[PDB]
Scaffold this motif. Structure first.
Motif, short mmCIF file in Angstrom:
data_model
loop_
_atom_site.label_atom_id
_atom_site.label_comp_id
_atom_site.label_asym_id
_atom_site.label_seq_id
_atom_site.Cartn_x
_atom_site.Cartn_y
_atom_site.Cartn_z
N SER A 285 43.38 56.24 29.43
CA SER A 285 44.38 57.15 29.54
C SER A 285 45.95 56.76 30.10
N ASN A 286 46.51 57.17 29.47
CA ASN A 286 47.98 56.86 29.97
C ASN A 286 48.57 57.11 30.69
N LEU A 287 48.32 56.27 31.97
CA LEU A 287 47.66 56.26 33.00
C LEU A 287 50.07 56.29 34.28
N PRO A 288 49.95 56.64 35.21
CA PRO A 288 50.71 56.86 35.57
C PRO A 288 51.25 55.35 35.51
N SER A 289 52.95 55.16 36.65
CA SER A 289 53.43 54.46 36.93
C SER A 289 53.79 53.55 38.38
N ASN A 290 54.07 52.45 38.50
CA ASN A 290 53.77 52.19 39.91
C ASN A 290 52.99 52.57 40.78
N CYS A 291 51.05 52.39 40.73
CA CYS A 291 50.27 52.26 41.56
C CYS A 291 49.25 51.22 41.13
N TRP A 292 48.29 50.90 41.88
CA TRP A 292 47.40 49.44 41.07
C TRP A 292 46.35 50.44 40.76
N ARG B 79 51.60 49.75 36.01
CA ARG B 79 52.66 50.00 34.48
C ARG B 79 53.92 50.09 35.20
N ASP B 80 54.84 49.55 35.57
CA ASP B 80 55.99 49.23 36.14
C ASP B 80 56.90 50.38 35.49
N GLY B 81 58.27 51.20 35.97
CA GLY B 81 58.50 51.94 35.61
C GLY B 81 59.54 51.98 33.73
#
Ligand SMILES: CC(=O)N[C@H]1[C@H](O[C@H]2[C@@H](O)[C@@H](CO)O[C@@H](O[C@H]3[C@H](O)[C@@H](O)[C@H](O)O[C@@H]3CO)[C@@H]2O)O[C@H](CO)[C@@H](O[C@@H]2O[C@H](CO)[C@H](O)[C@H](O)[C@H]2O)[C@@H]1O
Length: 162
Positions: free
Chosen positions: A11-18, A105-107
């Motif tokens: 997936s194109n995963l959301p940022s700033n979570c582990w 993945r960060d901002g």
């Protein structure tokens, strides 16, 4: 309370979570590329593995990599290239008694994960300076999702298991 486990997913995963992966098998556990500037995967190497060249299918290619883990712990080893024609080369790694590694993945689209020759004094969160903000991320293991605000909880899992 712990958010998961989730089945392996791309997936194109959301940022700033582990994304804390918990593989039960060796081999590729994580991969991401933007098909342009950055290709990264992590290979789980079993303890007591003599140096071997192995064939890996990752990100629509098949490549040969050298793996090795003479030590008594698992090794999550990162392999990276920054051109399509270039060979993958190992970079950072995590030597650990637990089959747990985590990715963020960060901002700006940079990948972070846990690095260390051990999961005590040498453990650190590392970041690769290779932004891939919109790339599909392949989590090839059951995984858990931990908000950035609970990163120390993630760290505890990396050290001590779920
Ligand atoms: C941030 C990081 O990845 N740190 C690694 C460290 O990486 C450095 C290493 O690959 C050198 C190779 O010469 O390049 C460094 O990048 C520079 C660019 O090459 C240069 O063109 C640019 O102008 O400046 C860049 C500055 O970063 C790169 O950061 O490599 C060391 C090993 O040599 C890693 O340490 C090892 O980490 C493992 C766990 O992964 C264990 O902890 C080992 O004990 C430890 O030695 C470091 O994490």
């Amino acid at each position: 309370s712990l958010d998961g486990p989730y089945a392996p997913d791309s997936s194109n995963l959301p940022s700033n979570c582990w994304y804390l992966v918990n593989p039960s098998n060796d081999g590729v556990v994580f991969s991401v590329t933007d098909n342009s500037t950055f290709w990264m995967f992590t290979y789980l190497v079993l303890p007591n593995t003599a140096q071997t060249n192995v064939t890996v299918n990752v990100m629509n290619e098949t490549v040969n990599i050298s793996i090795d883990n003479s030590g008594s712990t698992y090794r999550f080893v990162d392999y990276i290239k920054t051109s399509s024609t270039q060979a993958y080369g190992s970079r950072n790694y995590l030597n650990t008694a637990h089959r747990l590694q985590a990715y963020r993945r960060d901002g700006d689209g940079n990948i972070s994960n846990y690095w260390g020759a051990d999961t005590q004094g040498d453990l650190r969160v590392g970041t690769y300076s290779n932004p891939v903000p919109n790339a599909v991320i392949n989590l090839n293991a059951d995984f858990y999702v931990i908000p950035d605000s609970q990163q120390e909880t993630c760290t505890e899992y990396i050290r001590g298991g779920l």
